[PDB]
Design a protein around this nucleic acid. Sequence first.
RNA 1: GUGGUGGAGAGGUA
Lengths: 49, 187, 47, 200, 50, 97, 215, 209
Amino acid sequence: MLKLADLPESGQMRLFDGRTGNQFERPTTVGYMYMLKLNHLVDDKMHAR
Amino acid sequence: GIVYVGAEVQAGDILVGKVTPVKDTSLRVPTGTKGTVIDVQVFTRDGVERDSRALSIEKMQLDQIRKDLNEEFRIVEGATFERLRAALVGAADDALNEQLEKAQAYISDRRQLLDDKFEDKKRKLQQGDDLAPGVLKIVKVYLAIKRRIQPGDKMAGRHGNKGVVSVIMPVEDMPHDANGTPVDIVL
Amino acid sequence: YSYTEKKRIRKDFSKLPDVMDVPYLLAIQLDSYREFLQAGATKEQFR
Amino acid sequence: GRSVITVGPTLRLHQCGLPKKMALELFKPFIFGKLEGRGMATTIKAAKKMVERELPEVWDVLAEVIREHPVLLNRAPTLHRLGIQAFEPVLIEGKAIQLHPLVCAAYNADFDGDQMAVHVPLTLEAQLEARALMMSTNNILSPANGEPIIVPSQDVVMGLYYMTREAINAKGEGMAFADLQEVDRAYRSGQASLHARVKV
Amino acid sequence: ISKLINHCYRVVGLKDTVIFADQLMYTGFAYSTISGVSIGVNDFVIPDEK
Amino acid sequence: VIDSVDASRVVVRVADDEVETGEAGVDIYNLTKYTRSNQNTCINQRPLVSKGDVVARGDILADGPSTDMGELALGQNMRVAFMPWNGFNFEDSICLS
Amino acid sequence: FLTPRHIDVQVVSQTRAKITLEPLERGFGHTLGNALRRILLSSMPGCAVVEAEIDGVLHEYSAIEGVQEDVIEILLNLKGLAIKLHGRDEVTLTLAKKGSGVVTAADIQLDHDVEIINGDHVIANLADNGALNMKLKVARGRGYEPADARSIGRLQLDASFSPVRRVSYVVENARVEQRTNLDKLVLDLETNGTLDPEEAIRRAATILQQQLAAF
Amino acid sequence: NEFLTPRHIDVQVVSQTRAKITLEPLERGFGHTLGNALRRILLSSMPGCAVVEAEIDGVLHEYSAIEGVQEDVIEILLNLKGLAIKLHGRDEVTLTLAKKVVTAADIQLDHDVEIINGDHVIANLALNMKLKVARGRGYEPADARRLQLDASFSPVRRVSYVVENARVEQRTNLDKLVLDLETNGTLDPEEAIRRAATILQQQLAAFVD
RNA sequence: GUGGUGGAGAGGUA
Ligand SMILES: [Mg+2]
């Protein structure tokens, strides 16, 4: 599917640093991951007396 | 004595107008709580008066119920009327009159059904509540909070990979692809 | 072919054939209470 | 007080991050004392008025009292004296407690949602006890064994190990350098591989 | 790294030891960020003899 | 078939086959708007059907919280990268754009 | 010590475009490319909708009879509008419509100095009884302005004035026939189409020049 | 619109040639921009003069074994790498050293060339040196085009930078810029920063207005 | 010259 998607086969690409602009020497794994946010927000955790 | 619905409320703002002897038992939003009030509810014990807020609330509720049932009557009555007009030729003699009379009878039956249902719902609404003893009238309010994700909030994927968001750095600092596409999350 | 699936179709990577559909999940609770209630009573309701 | 942790990699070992609101809540009597002293507070009602509205003035005095006041930190399961340590707080905008990554090993505290309890010492005696005996810098070696406990953890170890490798055939191998600064200049220029056999 | 830190503490001192620790963390973080080290499915290598 | 749809209510013209003699088209679904869950989270339902759309029995007319037109959608999916970044993802923390 | 003249811009679409700087010193292009990328992604002045008032609504946690969507979707769609301010910074807009249909940016009233890029941007869908009349005040800002940093019934919105969406760049050599030791910079810029890529480059150049002039 | 435009740059002189500069008020994003840009500027493109060629009399090859001096040829070339020379006369010169202790002052010179430190040591007797010095832009190894040797025409021996939070009472999250410099001594580090700034400015003066 | 929380049960976090 990846090679059908015209994406790099190994699922890894060399990225570019967003501050130095220098490409990282080793290709890194990127992609789309289903990320959740749990009911543990700090707004109800920050107590102070 | 009640906040207008749809009012942004900072911390400590008074919400309910309550009077003691003659001090004030007025309710205030707790500190650290700030949002928008979206709904107010008021309930009164049997034998106690209904405040203008409750009167108005019951007003739009009754209006909504009436309009819903009127529309439900409208759709079915239109279907029946057009079905009858289609059965009859372009505008025998006894059959058409019989069908028109039967349609009128069905329309009257549905009208009386819907009206009786409306009176039943109305009567159900006008009743008081079985509030707790010592409680004359009770009032509750709701608030809406838009919790933006901020550093410290716990985030976890699907494979048992938890995490606490450390910082939120600007878009430039994110690692970007040669095409210029930056990533959002750096695990 | 259902209408809801017609709006978006997931490419299923299942190699195995589906031999029977997943049963209704909440039937475990729902059957118990409704059997305890015996709402529909015959001339002799279920003993 | 308490809150969740957050890794602060820009933190020196002796210092730790601190949310603004926790700082102003905890040190409130100190704020009152300073405000009455310098003169923008005459009555305490006015002092409460400014602290509740948070004028830009209150941040100055808040930073001043925080400046040299050590703060006391501990995790929930404290299994040894390193489980509770003193730090020199740094004000940050947020609700999480920034923590020094090296100290997490002592606390055995990962950032998977751990909450970290904070305390402040009041007496000069207590602050001196914190700074001279409980400061994170003071306790480096484990009391169980002389082995250090403020040790590079996963990521910094990875970086160090990656730096200290050798590639058999890498750009710039075999050429020499007069000084370390020359090596840095060559590498940052990108004309020299990070790990190539060289003379210096 | 642990041995080097322990050795430096007993040799150079404590203030310089913590300075070294902070600098070493800074360098390790920086050059780990420079390194494109990442985990992909191709990294796990199954020997053909298995 | 959907007679009309609004953000709060949905009316369905019931099929003549699956209807009694009288009261033929009656399927009112009042969508539950923003309501409080037991964990103080919002609960609301969204229409996912237009006027005149034919629906079969058991189709999903409107979906509630954490649902994306009939599917279960708990969180969100974003472009992620797996690399140590300035030690901000030091132990398990997350660096956020 | 060559420096680029007569900045060349070519257009892919009314949003996507390419910027090239022919004469550059060797190795210097990557530096400028990163600098321009960061500044462009950081601070371009843009105008986005910050306020929205609908006559029949009180708070955006409600729904309107005849309106296919709740208020929050309306304002979210309204957040994706690409508009331009030619004259003054702050302007107020109006959208009113009654009966069935789909409301786009076309339904908004235009103005002398005010103009909208994405007229095809759907905002909401209306039923037969559907009728909305919404009051919009927009402003031209620079960075992401949340509602918190910014009479009931007036609804605040979070503002992200940045008109740029993605920036990419690459460098190649420039055979100027004088020396092949030169290099040429290709800047791939894709925005919301509201601002001229040449204008963006000139603004970024001025900002960077001022930041350096701090020396 | 308007941004943070600092003026209070400060040079804490940690050494005559090693310096420290800071920039307190700055908008959150430009810290990394300016820091990385200036770092690469100082590394890449500062015109300077350095030796690229030498004639080790009696050492036909690089790894020839020489006598009369305790050290070996690699040490000698590492030494003469370190000299900082400003050439006011030309962009090309070949200098001669002949003596039979070696110091940089032992090299003859004309009114054109100038050596920053003739006190720098190279070797010791118990030495006909013909080395060629040229002007250049940055750090260019001889591999990139005794007869040859690496070069660092840039005058800054070492530059590093780091951005930490900048505290403004009502902004409270900004970037402070911190730069350290180490020039070859041929240039004042603060003057070097000025030179780099003028270079970067003269790059885009065509379009700023 | 004055300042306002017991116990049980259940669940959850580290
Ligand atoms: Mg943990």
